[PDB]
Amino acid sequence: GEWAYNPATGKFXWTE
């Protein structure tokens, strides 16, 4: 629950 970013897809998500 931190709002992480995945620079391989360009989308935000969690650490789940």
Side-chain angles (χ1 to χ4, degrees), residues 1-14:
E2 56 284 272
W3 277 98
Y5 187 73
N6 182 268
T9 50
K11 184 184 175 296
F12 282 91
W14 314 112

